[PDB]
Amino acid sequence: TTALVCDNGSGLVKAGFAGDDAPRAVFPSIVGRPRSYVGDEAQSKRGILTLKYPIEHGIITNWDDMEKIWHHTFYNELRVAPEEHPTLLTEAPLNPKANREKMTQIMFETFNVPAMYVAIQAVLSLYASGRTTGIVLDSGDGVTHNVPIYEGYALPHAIMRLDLAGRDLTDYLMKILTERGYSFVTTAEREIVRDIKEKLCYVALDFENEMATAASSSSLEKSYELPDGQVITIGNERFRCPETLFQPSFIGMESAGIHETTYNSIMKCDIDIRKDLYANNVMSGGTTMYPGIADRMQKEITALAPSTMKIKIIAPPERKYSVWIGGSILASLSTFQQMWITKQEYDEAGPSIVHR
Amino acid sequence: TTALVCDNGSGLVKAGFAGDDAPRAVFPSIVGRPRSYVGDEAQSKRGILTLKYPIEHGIITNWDDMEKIWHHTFYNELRVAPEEHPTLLTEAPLNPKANREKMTQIMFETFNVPAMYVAIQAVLSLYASGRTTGIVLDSGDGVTHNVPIYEGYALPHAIMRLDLAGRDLTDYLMKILTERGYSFVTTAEREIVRDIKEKLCYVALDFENEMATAASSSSLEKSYELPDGQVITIGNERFRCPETLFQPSFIGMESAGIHETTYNSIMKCDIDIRKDLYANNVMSGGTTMYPGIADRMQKEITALAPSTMKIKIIAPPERKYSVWIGGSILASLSTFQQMWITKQEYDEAGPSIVHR
Amino acid sequence: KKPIKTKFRLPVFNWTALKPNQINGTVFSELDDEKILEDLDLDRFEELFKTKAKVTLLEANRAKNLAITLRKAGRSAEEICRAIHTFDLQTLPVDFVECLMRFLPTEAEVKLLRQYERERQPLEELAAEDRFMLLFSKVERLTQRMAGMAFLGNFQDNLQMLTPQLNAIIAASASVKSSQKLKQMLEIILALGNYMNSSKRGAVYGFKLQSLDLLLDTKSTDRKMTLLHFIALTVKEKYPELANFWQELHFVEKAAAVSLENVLLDVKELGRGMELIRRECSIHDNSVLRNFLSTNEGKLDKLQRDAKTAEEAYNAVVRYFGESPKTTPPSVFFPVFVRFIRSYKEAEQENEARKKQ
Amino acid sequence: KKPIKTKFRLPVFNWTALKPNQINGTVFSELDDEKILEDLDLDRFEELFKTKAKVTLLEANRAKNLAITLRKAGRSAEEICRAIHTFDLQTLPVDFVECLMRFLPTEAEVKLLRQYERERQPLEELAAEDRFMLLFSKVERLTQRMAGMAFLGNFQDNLQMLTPQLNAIIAASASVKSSQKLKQMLEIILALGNYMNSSKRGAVYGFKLQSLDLLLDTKSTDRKMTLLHFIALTVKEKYPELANFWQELHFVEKAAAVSLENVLLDVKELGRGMELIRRECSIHDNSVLRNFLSTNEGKLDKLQRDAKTAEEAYNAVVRYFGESPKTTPPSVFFPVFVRFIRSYKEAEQENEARKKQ
Ligand SMILES: Nc1ncnc2c1ncn2[C@@H]1O[C@H](COP(=O)(O)OP(=O)(O)OP(=O)(O)O)[C@@H](O)[C@H]1O
Ligand SMILES: Nc1ncnc2c1ncn2[C@@H]1O[C@H](COP(=O)(O)OP(=O)(O)OP(=O)(O)O)[C@@H](O)[C@H]1O
């Protein structure tokens, strides 16, 4: 029996079979309804339907649309019979015991699954790097977290939720490409702007130092080819966009940037384990994808910590999917097997069995 | 020897002679310079000069313009010789010991004063109501504070600075009168909009309940007569403006409203004195002027405190000037006399004598 | 040694200077200002940088404070001590009694006053405040007369605020405890959810009160209605009289907001205070203490029998619904029902508007 | 007693139910579901609400953790124990040594393994992880061989980071301490401000270092320049060689950022670690411990003489400028100068651009 792994993202469902490679079913988590349709299809029929966003920010909010998600995941992309395969879904950090409890209930009652598990995404990401202790920076489409973890357990009041993430950075690149004269504010064709963000732009090691080079190097700026014939160019705004991570103030937030969030997260934690936290520090998810973000982070934390502090950033080449892979690893893990919840024991204890 | 009392406000210098009645010299604290002129004159020559705002928000920032202020205060409005009269200036809460120290230095060295004192405005306000203990809500033009005070001493880490105040409420009334179709966005003639705010509009006891009456009563709305011939009318936006105090979100702030600010200010304080803090609660300054604000406040705190909690709001009819009067009271006070700083002892200890 | 001339008064430089006993081990005794005499040309310096040329026995702060208080008073020290002797039968201003109470002299500053009255003649050479404090400590039983006066001015406004809370707990606690249309609703729930929850997990004879809150929680397979909606339709159909049922419980919202432990100990404190009043009035006032105690002691007694029945009533309901009154306050207990009523009410609005179309 | 039928599997209702021993005192034993049989009509209910129808000796968490670790390893328990025996002369992966170190067996779970090897035959019926742990505790002196291997893989990168901080303190500490063009500047200040500060307040032979910071502070009567500006002009005129003077101090910015107490105790720890290496290598390895210890002990010694001189150098400057090295770190001390230089530099830019325009 192949088990199943579903990572439910603020912008994206990343899902597929355990036995680690990658999720082969990855789609925008969106629910369209007549003024039901799920995924990229909803992007296509957009405006004829009103898209609702169940997993926006951290937590699954309205459950009905979520059901629509898991149905489409199972029955369409994944193309399986949920009755057959034990399923592992992920959850945001700080996710409340009732969120988790109604997840399990929808699993067993709606999809008829044999067994299941709900696991904390940023612990899966720390698993995929071969670690049981450390601090993850999990940065997605809609949320960001700094999750301290010790002996597999994420330390509850350590976690710092930044409400800034990839969709917001896409918005910022809209704003600042417009200021450069480029013409797309359109909620349709902005689906190309994102692409720019993903293909070219990056994180400066020293911001102003690189924005001193604003016009100096012509090969500092890059050439972007639109899907159709026409082509355009991208200047300094390139590195200026992911900068918003470290300086949230760019979009107007009064929250700390990253390195801070990271830092006082570590600092919330017990004095002993602090060392191990700095040493093992794992960045995960598609907004941790910008080139050079690891080193910039590195220098910026080396700044906050003492002189003698061993500080390492672990930024895996495959980390866009970090959680999900840590999912596969965990599901396919053998000693994990006894920890699965089953219909037997849910029907025994009800949804509140989900606590371990 | 008549002493002098200068209250340096975020928008307004309230100053005059001790022996309490009221400041007879009250002018906008603004410094014009050629692209020097101080006060309402700067309002008149506006745009021909660039107005700088030394006391905007809490603290005196640029001192040169401040010197211009005190010179105009002394030599023009007040029409005295500073060498002659001991002077009492006020200061924001949390004002840093160097701000205070250079105040004193400018006093003795630039204006040649015989003696002086710097006192914390919101303690003067609590003095003018005959109290040495309690919590002031001092709300001015540019800042707002909740200042806990025990035995005359303001408790330093209690004080909560809200960056919202009267100028901001004047802006809000601009925004929401425009939404009603009225045509003045002008940074000149908006000096009438403020007037509306001051003469008519007020604080609802239950917001929505009163905005349910939005169009019901015609005598709920009031008739406003412009300076010239034409006349206009004011609807719900009337009570909607001071609401921004209790709901900062209206302008877009993520800061607590008032009652909260008040409350966790009290709650920052030692458990014993809490009682005395709720019991004696003094509102002061021209943004505490809106009719009914005292009772609204009252009900809103009675909400947060326990059942049996004695909670009294002191909102004096003369409190627009509260601090300044508490100033007169203090300067004219006899046992205050030994507490004055003098040139003898400044020239002995230098500006760091200002600490008591 | 050797200070400078200073034609013009240079601005103080606020540097923190080193005492010469520290100076020895440092860079600072290497070389001196003795080279620097003309040199830099002190003249254009000084032209460029030029500026423009009774007795208290109370600690001064305490003094200032007192002054600020009495200034507001308007009353003389004599008027005041006369008032405390007569129990503010001259203008009882409880506020002012309250402020004043903090300024009661400590024995430490009773020492500075005491023989130093008889010794010399500080009188009329004494600061107003010190004189006041003297005459203030002159009043016999000062502390207790103060307390008494505070108590007196407060008592009315006191049970003004204390009574209705006691009432609102009493009212609500019983109207809930005694409602049949409630016990009915609950028993329908027990049924329906036992039906659901049986065949596995067992079957149970009752549920802790929290349960009510997940009602809206578990929806229809349709997803269009909720359980609560269903219980509503099932009420309007099979059991129509219950469709109101909230109207049998009353002060529950108001009783939620009561913090009762406080209310009780406030009552007890009032008790000790009355006792002080009678103890003082005894030996001896006796004017206007009697004139209070009579017209009051029965009011106090009503508050006390209402406290006892309030407490007993509330403990009764809590234990009646399964919870622990020792561990739960009204601020938790009652809102459960509030939320359930508010929701139920909300439910039928939808159950109604759905039937319309 | 008496559960229901359940044709369709109704959703669990998650209510928290009351145990019948609690049920007695409550509303819940008044009346029951026995009235409610058909009534509400269970049929359209259930139509409306229907849903769709080896062995471990390690605690399971610890187990899971270990697994996640070794899975990343790729190495067998045998390869691994062979490596710890040979001191990772088979592929030394210090990271993995570090992770693994936490999983060292506690004596408590040495008990579960120990005789329960000899007793029965858990072997091949043992979970991979438990087997690994067995063979893992099989390694003699496990804890210390681990420690040693950690130490070894770390030492290079260690003094890689430790040395230049020790150097930067040393450099900066002395370049400051030993600069004449500095002592000069300071002495001009002492003069100028003593001139100011005299005729009242006295005259003083030196000032604590903080003083430097309020230089920009006290302006001209003109308000157009500052004191620092003036000292700058006075330098360019009367004492031109000093107009650079910052160029005589060097690592001060870098040395500011050094947290020295840490650096020293890190050095001490390194010492204890080397001692562990020699103690182990002694009795007995001896391969590749010797091959380390030789090529290292001199490097370590250089770090140690550089620690001693770093500490002595720094204490020297701090005391030299009046402050307490016991109470002040470089993170405070050096930025004083930094700010002053940066400002001085900033000052002359204005003193220059003013002369032009
Ligand atoms: N190379 C890249 N450069 C920039 N942004 C990227 C890159 N790859 C992916 N992204 C962005 O990352 C965001 C989605 O990240 P991700 O899907 O990991 O988060 P999520 O699914 O919402 O939550 P989680 O991190 O828990 O999975 C999208 O906005 C996408 O544009
Ligand atoms: N009747 C009134 N209603 C509403 N606002 C008023 C009224 N009278 C004055 N104000 C407002 O008060 C503000 C200024 O108050 P005030 O000058 O007392 O405070 P400040 O100058 O900020 O400093 P401080 O707190 O020291 O007094 C102005 O912005 C004005 O709009």
PDB file of C-alpha atoms in Angstrom, chain C residues 1 3-4 6 9-18 20 22-23 25-28 30-33 35-36 39-42 44-46 48-50 52 183 186-187 189-201 203-208 210-211 214-215 218-223 225-227 230 234 238-239 320-322, chain D residues 1 3-4 6 9-18 20 22-23 25-28 30-33 35-36 39-42 44-46 48-50 52 183 186-187 189-201 203-208 210-211 214-215 218-223 225-227 230 234 238-239 320-322:
ATOM      1  CA  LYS C   1      45.123  74.369  39.432  1.00  0.00           C
ATOM      2  CA  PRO C   3      41.568  77.943  35.330  1.00  0.00           C
ATOM      3  CA  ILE C   4      41.157  80.222  32.256  1.00  0.00           C
ATOM      4  CA  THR C   6      36.598  83.667  29.911  1.00  0.00           C
ATOM      5  CA  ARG C   9      30.847  82.968  29.076  1.00  0.00           C
ATOM      6  CA  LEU C  10      31.433  79.971  26.763  1.00  0.00           C
ATOM      7  CA  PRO C  11      28.608  77.341  26.705  1.00  0.00           C
ATOM      8  CA  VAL C  12      29.119  74.634  29.326  1.00  0.00           C
ATOM      9  CA  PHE C  13      30.633  71.529  27.769  1.00  0.00           C
ATOM     10  CA  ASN C  14      28.910  68.674  29.517  1.00  0.00           C
ATOM     11  CA  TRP C  15      31.710  66.117  29.188  1.00  0.00           C
ATOM     12  CA  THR C  16      32.186  63.758  32.057  1.00  0.00           C
ATOM     13  CA  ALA C  17      35.587  64.717  33.423  1.00  0.00           C
ATOM     14  CA  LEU C  18      38.258  62.508  35.075  1.00  0.00           C
ATOM     15  CA  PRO C  20      43.145  63.608  38.789  1.00  0.00           C
ATOM     16  CA  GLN C  22      42.313  58.534  37.858  1.00  0.00           C
ATOM     17  CA  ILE C  23      44.345  60.776  35.517  1.00  0.00           C
ATOM     18  CA  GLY C  25      47.473  55.891  34.597  1.00  0.00           C
ATOM     19  CA  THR C  26      46.034  57.286  31.378  1.00  0.00           C
ATOM     20  CA  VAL C  27      46.836  59.096  28.143  1.00  0.00           C
ATOM     21  CA  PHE C  28      45.699  62.246  29.853  1.00  0.00           C
ATOM     22  CA  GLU C  30      51.194  62.776  28.846  1.00  0.00           C
ATOM     23  CA  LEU C  31      50.887  66.396  27.762  1.00  0.00           C
ATOM     24  CA  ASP C  32      48.759  69.409  28.652  1.00  0.00           C
ATOM     25  CA  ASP C  33      46.982  72.665  27.672  1.00  0.00           C
ATOM     26  CA  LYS C  35      51.317  74.184  24.860  1.00  0.00           C
ATOM     27  CA  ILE C  36      47.917  75.334  23.607  1.00  0.00           C
ATOM     28  CA  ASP C  39      47.955  78.671  19.169  1.00  0.00           C
ATOM     29  CA  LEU C  40      44.414  77.862  18.084  1.00  0.00           C
ATOM     30  CA  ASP C  41      43.649  81.592  18.645  1.00  0.00           C
ATOM     31  CA  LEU C  42      41.172  81.684  21.557  1.00  0.00           C
ATOM     32  CA  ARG C  44      37.799  83.991  17.259  1.00  0.00           C
ATOM     33  CA  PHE C  45      36.763  81.010  19.314  1.00  0.00           C
ATOM     34  CA  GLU C  46      35.162  83.064  22.026  1.00  0.00           C
ATOM     35  CA  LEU C  48      32.275  82.346  17.430  1.00  0.00           C
ATOM     36  CA  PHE C  49      30.899  80.337  20.360  1.00  0.00           C
ATOM     37  CA  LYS C  50      29.732  83.186  22.693  1.00  0.00           C
ATOM     38  CA  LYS C  52      24.295  85.876  26.131  1.00  0.00           C
ATOM     39  CA  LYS C 183     -34.112  20.819  30.130  1.00  0.00           C
ATOM     40  CA  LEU C 186     -31.019  19.594  26.262  1.00  0.00           C
ATOM     41  CA  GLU C 187     -32.767  16.258  26.308  1.00  0.00           C
ATOM     42  CA  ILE C 189     -29.757  17.111  22.040  1.00  0.00           C
ATOM     43  CA  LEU C 190     -28.816  14.162  24.313  1.00  0.00           C
ATOM     44  CA  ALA C 191     -31.078  12.050  22.163  1.00  0.00           C
ATOM     45  CA  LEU C 192     -29.983  13.167  18.702  1.00  0.00           C
ATOM     46  CA  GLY C 193     -26.267  13.095  19.495  1.00  0.00           C
ATOM     47  CA  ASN C 194     -26.559   9.800  21.345  1.00  0.00           C
ATOM     48  CA  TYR C 195     -28.108   8.382  18.176  1.00  0.00           C
ATOM     49  CA  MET C 196     -25.179   9.742  16.203  1.00  0.00           C
ATOM     50  CA  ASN C 197     -22.603   8.704  18.768  1.00  0.00           C
ATOM     51  CA  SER C 198     -23.887   5.193  19.380  1.00  0.00           C
ATOM     52  CA  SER C 199     -23.100   1.762  17.843  1.00  0.00           C
ATOM     53  CA  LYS C 200     -19.477   2.766  18.511  1.00  0.00           C
ATOM     54  CA  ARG C 201     -18.143   4.934  21.389  1.00  0.00           C
ATOM     55  CA  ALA C 203     -24.095   5.739  24.647  1.00  0.00           C
ATOM     56  CA  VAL C 204     -24.105   8.334  27.398  1.00  0.00           C
ATOM     57  CA  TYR C 205     -26.624   9.829  29.865  1.00  0.00           C
ATOM     58  CA  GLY C 206     -25.514  13.489  29.695  1.00  0.00           C
ATOM     59  CA  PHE C 207     -22.867  15.892  28.458  1.00  0.00           C
ATOM     60  CA  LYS C 208     -20.687  18.625  29.978  1.00  0.00           C
ATOM     61  CA  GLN C 210     -18.977  22.970  26.526  1.00  0.00           C
ATOM     62  CA  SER C 211     -20.651  20.553  24.164  1.00  0.00           C
ATOM     63  CA  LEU C 214     -20.044  22.549  18.709  1.00  0.00           C
ATOM     64  CA  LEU C 215     -23.551  22.388  17.356  1.00  0.00           C
ATOM     65  CA  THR C 218     -21.164  19.448  12.473  1.00  0.00           C
ATOM     66  CA  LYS C 219     -23.026  20.197   9.228  1.00  0.00           C
ATOM     67  CA  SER C 220     -25.338  18.316   6.846  1.00  0.00           C
ATOM     68  CA  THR C 221     -23.917  16.076   4.095  1.00  0.00           C
ATOM     69  CA  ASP C 222     -25.657  18.645   1.910  1.00  0.00           C
ATOM     70  CA  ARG C 223     -23.428  21.218   3.721  1.00  0.00           C
ATOM     71  CA  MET C 225     -27.726  23.494   6.910  1.00  0.00           C
ATOM     72  CA  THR C 226     -26.228  22.730  10.330  1.00  0.00           C
ATOM     73  CA  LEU C 227     -27.154  20.422  13.185  1.00  0.00           C
ATOM     74  CA  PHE C 230     -31.979  20.770  12.185  1.00  0.00           C
ATOM     75  CA  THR C 234     -37.405  19.616  14.484  1.00  0.00           C
ATOM     76  CA  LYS C 238     -42.442  18.192  16.532  1.00  0.00           C
ATOM     77  CA  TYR C 239     -42.178  20.483  19.609  1.00  0.00           C
ATOM     78  CA  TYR C 320     -26.561  21.127  38.346  1.00  0.00           C
ATOM     79  CA  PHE C 321     -24.989  21.332  34.884  1.00  0.00           C
ATOM     80  CA  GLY C 322     -22.014  19.141  35.844  1.00  0.00           C
TER      81      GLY C 322
ATOM     82  CA  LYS D   1     -27.247   0.331  28.379  1.00  0.00           C
ATOM     83  CA  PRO D   3     -27.335   1.916  22.050  1.00  0.00           C
ATOM     84  CA  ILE D   4     -29.134   2.795  18.776  1.00  0.00           C
ATOM     85  CA  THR D   6     -27.464   3.396  12.867  1.00  0.00           C
ATOM     86  CA  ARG D   9     -22.966   5.883  10.038  1.00  0.00           C
ATOM     87  CA  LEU D  10     -23.901   9.350  11.411  1.00  0.00           C
ATOM     88  CA  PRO D  11     -20.925  11.795  11.849  1.00  0.00           C
ATOM     89  CA  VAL D  12     -19.325  11.531  15.272  1.00  0.00           C
ATOM     90  CA  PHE D  13     -20.593  14.251  17.567  1.00  0.00           C
ATOM     91  CA  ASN D  14     -17.566  15.251  19.572  1.00  0.00           C
ATOM     92  CA  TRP D  15     -19.423  16.445  22.694  1.00  0.00           C
ATOM     93  CA  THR D  16     -17.759  15.798  25.985  1.00  0.00           C
ATOM     94  CA  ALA D  17     -20.131  13.349  27.661  1.00  0.00           C
ATOM     95  CA  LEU D  18     -20.876  12.905  31.372  1.00  0.00           C
ATOM     96  CA  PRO D  20     -23.245   8.276  34.824  1.00  0.00           C
ATOM     97  CA  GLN D  22     -21.763  12.419  37.633  1.00  0.00           C
ATOM     98  CA  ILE D  23     -25.207  12.157  35.948  1.00  0.00           C
ATOM     99  CA  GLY D  25     -26.960  15.152  40.657  1.00  0.00           C
ATOM    100  CA  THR D  26     -27.798  16.935  37.410  1.00  0.00           C
ATOM    101  CA  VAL D  27     -30.577  17.920  35.003  1.00  0.00           C
ATOM    102  CA  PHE D  28     -29.574  14.928  32.923  1.00  0.00           C
ATOM    103  CA  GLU D  30     -34.751  13.925  34.908  1.00  0.00           C
ATOM    104  CA  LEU D  31     -35.961  12.472  31.635  1.00  0.00           C
ATOM    105  CA  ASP D  32     -34.510  10.428  28.780  1.00  0.00           C
ATOM    106  CA  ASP D  33     -34.366   9.468  25.060  1.00  0.00           C
ATOM    107  CA  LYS D  35     -39.769   9.410  24.881  1.00  0.00           C
ATOM    108  CA  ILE D  36     -37.917  10.465  21.732  1.00  0.00           C
ATOM    109  CA  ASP D  39     -41.015  11.499  17.274  1.00  0.00           C
ATOM    110  CA  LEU D  40     -38.457  13.685  15.530  1.00  0.00           C
ATOM    111  CA  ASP D  41     -38.509  11.063  12.719  1.00  0.00           C
ATOM    112  CA  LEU D  42     -35.008   9.537  12.735  1.00  0.00           C
ATOM    113  CA  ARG D  44     -35.010  11.990   7.336  1.00  0.00           C
ATOM    114  CA  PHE D  45     -32.391  12.702   9.941  1.00  0.00           C
ATOM    115  CA  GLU D  46     -30.145   9.838   8.876  1.00  0.00           C
ATOM    116  CA  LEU D  48     -29.972  14.334   5.795  1.00  0.00           C
ATOM    117  CA  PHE D  49     -26.831  13.863   7.880  1.00  0.00           C
ATOM    118  CA  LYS D  50     -25.390  10.641   6.307  1.00  0.00           C
ATOM    119  CA  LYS D  52     -19.827   7.798   3.222  1.00  0.00           C
ATOM    120  CA  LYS D 183      46.505  61.600  22.121  1.00  0.00           C
ATOM    121  CA  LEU D 186      42.323  64.408  22.763  1.00  0.00           C
ATOM    122  CA  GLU D 187      44.604  66.964  24.314  1.00  0.00           C
ATOM    123  CA  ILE D 189      39.759  68.724  23.264  1.00  0.00           C
ATOM    124  CA  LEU D 190      40.872  68.745  26.925  1.00  0.00           C
ATOM    125  CA  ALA D 191      42.151  72.232  26.286  1.00  0.00           C
ATOM    126  CA  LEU D 192      39.206  73.678  24.404  1.00  0.00           C
ATOM    127  CA  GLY D 193      36.587  72.246  26.748  1.00  0.00           C
ATOM    128  CA  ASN D 194      38.600  73.134  29.832  1.00  0.00           C
ATOM    129  CA  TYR D 195      38.616  76.713  28.571  1.00  0.00           C
ATOM    130  CA  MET D 196      34.861  76.528  28.181  1.00  0.00           C
ATOM    131  CA  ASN D 197      34.289  74.711  31.453  1.00  0.00           C
ATOM    132  CA  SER D 198      36.562  76.883  33.602  1.00  0.00           C
ATOM    133  CA  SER D 199      35.999  79.985  35.776  1.00  0.00           C
ATOM    134  CA  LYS D 200      33.113  77.937  37.200  1.00  0.00           C
ATOM    135  CA  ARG D 201      32.953  74.131  37.653  1.00  0.00           C
ATOM    136  CA  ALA D 203      39.327  72.737  35.545  1.00  0.00           C
ATOM    137  CA  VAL D 204      40.078  69.099  34.951  1.00  0.00           C
ATOM    138  CA  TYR D 205      43.021  66.990  33.750  1.00  0.00           C
ATOM    139  CA  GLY D 206      41.071  64.527  31.571  1.00  0.00           C
ATOM    140  CA  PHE D 207      37.658  63.149  30.652  1.00  0.00           C
ATOM    141  CA  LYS D 208      35.981  59.756  30.494  1.00  0.00           C
ATOM    142  CA  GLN D 210      31.738  59.007  26.587  1.00  0.00           C
ATOM    143  CA  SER D 211      32.486  62.695  26.425  1.00  0.00           C
ATOM    144  CA  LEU D 214      28.712  65.191  22.730  1.00  0.00           C
ATOM    145  CA  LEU D 215      30.930  67.157  20.425  1.00  0.00           C
ATOM    146  CA  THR D 218      27.175  71.946  21.494  1.00  0.00           C
ATOM    147  CA  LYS D 219      26.879  74.301  18.498  1.00  0.00           C
ATOM    148  CA  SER D 220      28.035  77.815  17.567  1.00  0.00           C
ATOM    149  CA  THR D 221      26.015  80.857  18.604  1.00  0.00           C
ATOM    150  CA  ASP D 222      25.693  81.185  14.854  1.00  0.00           C
ATOM    151  CA  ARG D 223      24.127  77.688  15.006  1.00  0.00           C
ATOM    152  CA  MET D 225      28.732  75.037  12.641  1.00  0.00           C
ATOM    153  CA  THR D 226      29.417  72.675  15.549  1.00  0.00           C
ATOM    154  CA  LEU D 227      32.227  72.320  18.061  1.00  0.00           C
ATOM    155  CA  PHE D 230      35.616  74.065  14.854  1.00  0.00           C
ATOM    156  CA  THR D 234      41.531  74.469  14.012  1.00  0.00           C
ATOM    157  CA  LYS D 238      47.060  75.208  13.413  1.00  0.00           C
ATOM    158  CA  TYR D 239      47.850  71.451  13.331  1.00  0.00           C
ATOM    159  CA  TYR D 320      44.445  53.569  29.582  1.00  0.00           C
ATOM    160  CA  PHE D 321      41.335  55.510  28.638  1.00  0.00           C
ATOM    161  CA  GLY D 322      39.938  55.468  32.178  1.00  0.00           C
TER     162      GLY D 322
END
